PDB file of all heavy atoms in Angstrom:
ATOM      1  N   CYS B   2      -3.552  -5.332 -12.409  1.00  0.00           N
ATOM      2  CA  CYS B   2      -2.251  -5.482 -11.927  1.00  0.00           C
ATOM      3  C   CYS B   2      -1.254  -5.648 -13.079  1.00  0.00           C
ATOM      4  O   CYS B   2      -1.593  -5.849 -14.231  1.00  0.00           O
ATOM      5  CB  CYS B   2      -2.277  -6.669 -11.018  1.00  0.00           C
ATOM      6  SG  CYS B   2      -1.617  -8.161 -11.992  1.00  0.00           S
ATOM      7  N   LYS B   3       0.062  -5.343 -12.876  1.00  0.00           N
ATOM      8  CA  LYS B   3       1.043  -5.468 -13.957  1.00  0.00           C
ATOM      9  C   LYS B   3       1.853  -6.768 -13.872  1.00  0.00           C
ATOM     10  O   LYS B   3       2.427  -7.001 -12.885  1.00  0.00           O
ATOM     11  CB  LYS B   3       1.957  -4.276 -13.829  1.00  0.00           C
ATOM     12  CG  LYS B   3       1.191  -3.008 -14.195  1.00  0.00           C
ATOM     13  CD  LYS B   3       2.084  -2.078 -14.914  1.00  0.00           C
ATOM     14  CE  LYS B   3       1.266  -1.314 -16.051  1.00  0.00           C
ATOM     15  NZ  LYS B   3       1.925  -1.650 -17.305  1.00  0.00           N
ATOM     16  N   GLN B   4       1.935  -7.629 -14.832  1.00  0.00           N
ATOM     17  CA  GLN B   4       2.677  -8.744 -14.701  1.00  0.00           C
ATOM     18  C   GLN B   4       4.044  -8.544 -14.083  1.00  0.00           C
ATOM     19  O   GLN B   4       4.753  -7.564 -14.448  1.00  0.00           O
ATOM     20  CB  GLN B   4       2.905  -9.243 -16.199  1.00  0.00           C
ATOM     21  CG  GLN B   4       3.618 -10.634 -16.171  1.00  0.00           C
ATOM     22  CD  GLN B   4       2.642 -11.689 -16.763  1.00  0.00           C
ATOM     23  OE1 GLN B   4       1.471 -11.609 -16.628  1.00  0.00           O
ATOM     24  NE2 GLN B   4       3.168 -12.612 -17.617  1.00  0.00           N
ATOM     25  N   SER B   5       4.475  -9.352 -13.151  1.00  0.00           N
ATOM     26  CA  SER B   5       5.735  -8.931 -12.454  1.00  0.00           C
ATOM     27  C   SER B   5       6.880  -9.164 -13.564  1.00  0.00           C
ATOM     28  O   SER B   5       7.310 -10.317 -13.765  1.00  0.00           O
ATOM     29  CB  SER B   5       5.851 -10.027 -11.395  1.00  0.00           C
ATOM     30  OG  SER B   5       5.086  -9.674 -10.269  1.00  0.00           O
ATOM     31  N   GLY B   6       7.298  -8.138 -14.078  1.00  0.00           N
ATOM     32  CA  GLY B   6       8.316  -8.106 -15.107  1.00  0.00           C
ATOM     33  C   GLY B   6       7.933  -7.205 -16.272  1.00  0.00           C
ATOM     34  O   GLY B   6       8.619  -7.162 -17.286  1.00  0.00           O
ATOM     35  N   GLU B   7       6.887  -6.603 -16.265  1.00  0.00           N
ATOM     36  CA  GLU B   7       6.338  -5.564 -17.261  1.00  0.00           C
ATOM     37  C   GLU B   7       6.972  -4.188 -17.050  1.00  0.00           C
ATOM     38  O   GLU B   7       7.629  -4.015 -16.100  1.00  0.00           O
ATOM     39  CB  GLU B   7       4.875  -5.643 -17.230  1.00  0.00           C
ATOM     40  CG  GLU B   7       4.300  -6.609 -18.183  1.00  0.00           C
ATOM     41  CD  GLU B   7       4.455  -6.173 -19.676  1.00  0.00           C
ATOM     42  OE1 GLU B   7       5.492  -5.519 -20.046  1.00  0.00           O
ATOM     43  OE2 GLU B   7       3.579  -6.325 -20.513  1.00  0.00           O
ATOM     44  N   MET B   8       6.583  -3.277 -17.776  1.00  0.00           N
ATOM     45  CA  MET B   8       7.087  -1.864 -17.566  1.00  0.00           C
ATOM     46  C   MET B   8       6.443  -1.308 -16.328  1.00  0.00           C
ATOM     47  O   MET B   8       5.255  -1.244 -16.175  1.00  0.00           O
ATOM     48  CB  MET B   8       6.619  -1.155 -18.801  1.00  0.00           C
ATOM     49  CG  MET B   8       7.632  -0.195 -19.291  1.00  0.00           C
ATOM     50  SD  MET B   8       8.176  -0.867 -20.908  1.00  0.00           S
ATOM     51  CE  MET B   8       8.183   0.746 -21.793  1.00  0.00           C
ATOM     52  N   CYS B   9       7.208  -0.941 -15.295  1.00  0.00           N
ATOM     53  CA  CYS B   9       6.794  -0.336 -14.120  1.00  0.00           C
ATOM     54  C   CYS B   9       7.273   0.987 -13.768  1.00  0.00           C
ATOM     55  O   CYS B   9       7.917   1.596 -14.606  1.00  0.00           O
ATOM     56  CB  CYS B   9       7.237  -1.286 -12.945  1.00  0.00           C
ATOM     57  SG  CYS B   9       8.959  -1.271 -12.826  1.00  0.00           S
ATOM     58  N   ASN B  10       7.017   1.525 -12.537  1.00  0.00           N
ATOM     59  CA  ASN B  10       7.522   2.830 -12.318  1.00  0.00           C
ATOM     60  C   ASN B  10       8.178   2.847 -10.915  1.00  0.00           C
ATOM     61  O   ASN B  10       7.853   1.957 -10.025  1.00  0.00           O
ATOM     62  CB  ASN B  10       6.243   3.712 -12.219  1.00  0.00           C
ATOM     63  CG  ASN B  10       6.471   4.961 -13.097  1.00  0.00           C
ATOM     64  OD1 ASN B  10       6.160   6.057 -12.562  1.00  0.00           O
ATOM     65  ND2 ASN B  10       7.076   4.852 -14.284  1.00  0.00           N
ATOM     66  N   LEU B  11       9.220   3.642 -10.698  1.00  0.00           N
ATOM     67  CA  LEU B  11       9.986   3.673  -9.369  1.00  0.00           C
ATOM     68  C   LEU B  11       9.042   4.529  -8.273  1.00  0.00           C
ATOM     69  O   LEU B  11       9.351   4.377  -7.239  1.00  0.00           O
ATOM     70  CB  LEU B  11      11.203   4.397  -9.688  1.00  0.00           C
ATOM     71  CG  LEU B  11      12.285   3.242  -9.955  1.00  0.00           C
ATOM     72  CD1 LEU B  11      13.440   3.977 -10.686  1.00  0.00           C
ATOM     73  CD2 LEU B  11      12.733   2.662  -8.596  1.00  0.00           C
ATOM     74  N   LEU B  12       8.160   5.154  -8.762  1.00  0.00           N
ATOM     75  CA  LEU B  12       7.306   6.056  -7.863  1.00  0.00           C
ATOM     76  C   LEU B  12       5.869   5.656  -7.903  1.00  0.00           C
ATOM     77  O   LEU B  12       5.150   5.643  -6.923  1.00  0.00           O
ATOM     78  CB  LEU B  12       7.571   7.567  -8.297  1.00  0.00           C
ATOM     79  CG  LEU B  12       8.150   8.214  -7.209  1.00  0.00           C
ATOM     80  CD1 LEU B  12       7.387   8.135  -5.885  1.00  0.00           C
ATOM     81  CD2 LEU B  12       9.657   7.701  -7.007  1.00  0.00           C
ATOM     82  N   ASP B  13       5.365   5.315  -9.134  1.00  0.00           N
ATOM     83  CA  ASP B  13       3.869   4.972  -9.240  1.00  0.00           C
ATOM     84  C   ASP B  13       3.811   3.592  -9.854  1.00  0.00           C
ATOM     85  O   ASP B  13       3.164   3.379 -10.950  1.00  0.00           O
ATOM     86  CB  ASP B  13       3.353   6.027 -10.266  1.00  0.00           C
ATOM     87  CG  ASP B  13       1.868   6.057  -9.956  1.00  0.00           C
ATOM     88  OD1 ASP B  13       1.475   5.755  -8.906  1.00  0.00           O
ATOM     89  OD2 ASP B  13       1.152   6.653 -10.922  1.00  0.00           O
ATOM     90  N   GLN B  14       4.567   2.543  -9.284  1.00  0.00           N
ATOM     91  CA  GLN B  14       4.506   1.246  -9.869  1.00  0.00           C
ATOM     92  C   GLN B  14       3.216   0.470  -9.254  1.00  0.00           C
ATOM     93  O   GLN B  14       2.609   0.894  -8.374  1.00  0.00           O
ATOM     94  CB  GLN B  14       5.623   0.494  -9.313  1.00  0.00           C
ATOM     95  CG  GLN B  14       5.431  -0.863  -8.841  1.00  0.00           C
ATOM     96  CD  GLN B  14       4.821  -1.001  -7.418  1.00  0.00           C
ATOM     97  OE1 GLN B  14       4.732  -1.948  -6.827  1.00  0.00           O
ATOM     98  NE2 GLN B  14       4.484   0.195  -6.964  1.00  0.00           N
ATOM     99  N   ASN B  15       2.832  -0.513  -9.993  1.00  0.00           N
ATOM    100  CA  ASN B  15       1.569  -1.223  -9.591  1.00  0.00           C
ATOM    101  C   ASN B  15       1.643  -2.736  -9.969  1.00  0.00           C
ATOM    102  O   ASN B  15       0.863  -3.365 -10.558  1.00  0.00           O
ATOM    103  CB  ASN B  15       0.399  -0.652 -10.514  1.00  0.00           C
ATOM    104  CG  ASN B  15       0.163   0.794  -9.885  1.00  0.00           C
ATOM    105  OD1 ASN B  15      -0.826   0.951  -9.130  1.00  0.00           O
ATOM    106  ND2 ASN B  15       0.852   1.796 -10.252  1.00  0.00           N
ATOM    107  N   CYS B  16       2.775  -3.317  -9.617  1.00  0.00           N
ATOM    108  CA  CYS B  16       3.031  -4.723  -9.919  1.00  0.00           C
ATOM    109  C   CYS B  16       2.000  -5.597  -9.252  1.00  0.00           C
ATOM    110  O   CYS B  16       1.182  -5.150  -8.363  1.00  0.00           O
ATOM    111  CB  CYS B  16       4.423  -5.205  -9.240  1.00  0.00           C
ATOM    112  SG  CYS B  16       5.594  -3.900  -9.781  1.00  0.00           S
ATOM    113  N   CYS B  17       1.719  -6.783  -9.743  1.00  0.00           N
ATOM    114  CA  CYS B  17       0.548  -7.628  -9.143  1.00  0.00           C
ATOM    115  C   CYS B  17       0.754  -7.849  -7.695  1.00  0.00           C
ATOM    116  O   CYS B  17      -0.045  -7.766  -6.894  1.00  0.00           O
ATOM    117  CB  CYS B  17       0.660  -8.921 -10.030  1.00  0.00           C
ATOM    118  SG  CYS B  17      -1.120  -9.450 -10.370  1.00  0.00           S
TER     119      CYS B  17
END
Side-chain angles (χ1 to χ4, degrees):
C2 97
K3 289 218 146 238
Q4 185 115 322
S5 277
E7 268 282 43
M8 225 111 135
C9 70
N10 230 224
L11 266 160
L12 243 304
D13 208 19
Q14 139 279 192
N15 287 263
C16 313
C17 222

